[PDB]
């Protein structure tokens, strides 16, 4: 029974691999031979936010490229104004351990979460707790907003849940990973979202139907972070194999792998630019690298952080790049 | 204009609040309790991670117990990077829990992010099955007591050699590597002994003394 059923899975995987390898006449890095190089890109540090006692773990930009929210490991959620480097808000947290945050698109709500496996939604317009969502039996890793009545969260029990805020119930649950989900990034249509797990795998999920469609496995270690190409037909994944990769949706294969001989450190976060030509990857060697998105050649290096880079963000307008390390110093690059 | 002044006032108030909370944060020492085997000896005088706060000699102490989490721990263990002490409780009864505990300690001892954090080792569950280890380990028939001060509370048979052999294996994993800036603190504790709040106190004090001596380039 079990022995014969594994044969069906093996045959299906063989057929899938044969189909994938059949339609690979052009593998890029051969088509891309007439484009001019990016050149030299150097960014100077403009601002250095210093208001956190412990290591920052995440950050998320607002909808107007100005307001920012930063979550520390000392039970602090600081809402900042980037241009004038002032702290508009500083919310304490019941659970000092925080591993994710999100700024609501409508600009009235905030989301926080950590090892306490509970998602705290805070109002902003005195500051109180709008709601507490007690769901998964694991630990949250990344929470993203859809509207003021829904939220999508990823936990450590191989689960991704869609929540309705008013009733506080799991409207839909997503399973299919054999390891904890590290991070998710919504597509710019609020219809699909990709999620990477700790088994060298990424999957694409549909919010409405609730059924998984496609999986991608090309890495060799955990997929720490995953970001979506602005077009919506590709996404980038960062792993612990000292590599980053680009994956296509319609092609359903692996397009390009960015790696270097000297780099032997992991990748923490990856954020795309508005144009789609640069991929900014934070490394564990305390420095960030800007990679060409079509030539697979190193474009730039940003240094200045003493400890490892924990989180990275790029605004909608594409004006500033925000890096947050474990030295509790946010840095803005332009 | 006038709208900028209100922002300045709000920033000043929030800065004052953060200044007030800085002293409170820096005046408390956090601990990470961890281990398999009789981790229910919590003395106080569903959810994800439980917290316990207590004061010994008017010094605050925080303790975190990892509750509803998956078996795999390679991801959330990185959170406890700046914790003053990691309490590791290892059962000393005998499948083959001792080998798995020793391997887990080895893994947490040679990690990049936990290379600076110090480990306080508890060996609870005093042996009585091994009174009337064995052939599970090979290096037991040619090991003698390492001239250590036997406690001698009234009696001390070969159980002393058994305990010191377990400690010797732990140390041979410990002291054979490690870049620096951390040490292992062995201890012999019973189930309760109504004194385990003092060993942690002394070990934290020693850790701070060593760190400050290393900072002043004296050691």
């Amino acid at each position, epitope marked *: 029974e079990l022995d014969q059923l594994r044969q069906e899975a093996e045959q299906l995987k063989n057929q899938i691999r044969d189909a994938r390898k059949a339609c690979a006449d052009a593998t890029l890095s051969q088509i891309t031979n007439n484009i001019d190089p990016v050149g030299r890109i150097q960014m100077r540090t403009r601002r250095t936010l210093r208001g956190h006692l412990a290591k920052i773990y995440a950050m998320h930009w607002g909808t107007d490229s100005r307001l920012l929210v930063s979550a520390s490991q000392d039970g602090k959620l600081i809402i900042w104004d980037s241009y004038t480097t002032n702290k508009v808000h500083a919310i304490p947290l019941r659970s000092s351990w925080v591993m994710t945050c999100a700024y609501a698109p409508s600009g009235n709500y905030v989301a926080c979460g950590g090892l306490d496996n509970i998602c705290s939604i805070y109002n902003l317009k005195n500051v109180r707790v709008s709601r507490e969502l007690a769901g998964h039996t694991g630990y949250l890793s990344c929470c993203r907003f859809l509207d003021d009545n829904q939220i999508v969260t990823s936990s450590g029990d191989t689960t991704c849940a869609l929540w309705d805020i008013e009733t506080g119930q799991q409207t839909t649950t997503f399973t299919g990973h054999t390891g904890d989900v590290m991070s998710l990034s919504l597509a710019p249509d609020t219809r699909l979202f990709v999620s990477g797990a700790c088994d060298a795998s990424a999957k694409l999920w549909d919010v409405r139907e609730g059924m998984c469609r496609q999986t991608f496995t090309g890495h060799e270690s*955990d997929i720490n972070a995953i970001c979506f190409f602005p077009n919506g037909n590709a996404f980038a994944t960062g792993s612990d194999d000292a590599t980053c990769r680009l994956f296509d949706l319609r092609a359903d294969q692996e397009l390009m792998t960015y790696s270097h001989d000297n780099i032997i450190c992991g990748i923490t976060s990856v954020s795309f630019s508005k144009s789609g030509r640069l991929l900014l990857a934070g490394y564990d060697d305390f420095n960030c690298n800007v990679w060409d998105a079509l030539k697979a050649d190193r474009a730039g290096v940003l240094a200045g952080h003493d400890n490892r880079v924990s989180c990275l963000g790029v605004t909608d307008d594409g004006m500033a790049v925000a890096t947050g390390s474990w030295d509790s110093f946010l840095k803005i690059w332009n | 204009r006038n709208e900028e002044k209100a922002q300045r006032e709000a920033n000043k108030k929030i800065e004052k609040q953060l200044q007030k909370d800085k002293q409170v944060y820096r005046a408390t020492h956090r601990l990470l309790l961890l281990g398999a085997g009789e981790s229910g000896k919590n003395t106080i005088v569903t959810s994800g991670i439980f917290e316990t706060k207590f004061q010994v000699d008017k010094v605050n102490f925080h303790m975190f117990d990892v509750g509803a989490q998956r078996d795999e721990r390679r991801k959330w263990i990185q959170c406890f990077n700046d914790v003053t002490a990691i309490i590791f409780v290892v059962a000393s009864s005998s499948t083959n829990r001792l080998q798995a505990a020793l391997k887990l300690f080895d893994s947490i001892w040679n990690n990049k992010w936990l290379r600076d954090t110090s480990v306080i080792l508890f060996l609870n569950k005093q042996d009585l099955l091994a009174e009337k280890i064995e052939d599970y380990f090979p290096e037991f028939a040619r090991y003698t007591t390492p001239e250590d001060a036997t406690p001698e509370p009234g009696e001390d048979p070969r159980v002393t050699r058994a305990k010191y052999f377990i400690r010797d294996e732990f140390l041979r994993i410990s002291t054979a590597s490690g870049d620096g800036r951390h040490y292992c603190y062995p201890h012999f504790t019973c189930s309760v002994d109504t004194e385990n709040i003092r060993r942690v106190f002394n070990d934290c004090r020693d850790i701070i003394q060593r760190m400050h001596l290393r900072q002043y380039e004296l050691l």
Partner: nanobody
Amino acid sequence: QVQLQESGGGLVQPGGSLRLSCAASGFTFSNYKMNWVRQAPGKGLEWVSDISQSGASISYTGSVKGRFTISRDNAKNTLYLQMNSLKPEDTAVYYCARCPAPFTRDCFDVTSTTYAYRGQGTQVTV
């Protein structure tokens, strides 16, 4: 993805020998550490042996040292686990696992929550 196929083992009597070949595909076999894991029926998984990245810091548990030997060959990227002088208490299922990350000594390859870096393994009965 990462594939680990175990070939070897079967019905044997005490004092027999069985080599367990661990064919590894889908990564670079010359960096990650390798380990063997045993599972008795109705019991938790247990650790057996270990080989370093280069292949010089061999390690065994007490019950297997002096009877079992492991070696790594990069050219054919396979593990061996040469077994000798078997005892009737070794009947179990064997898995061949690797550590999650390269160029590091940290390893957490014993969990029973469907760890994705170990194969189906093979049954060894004595």
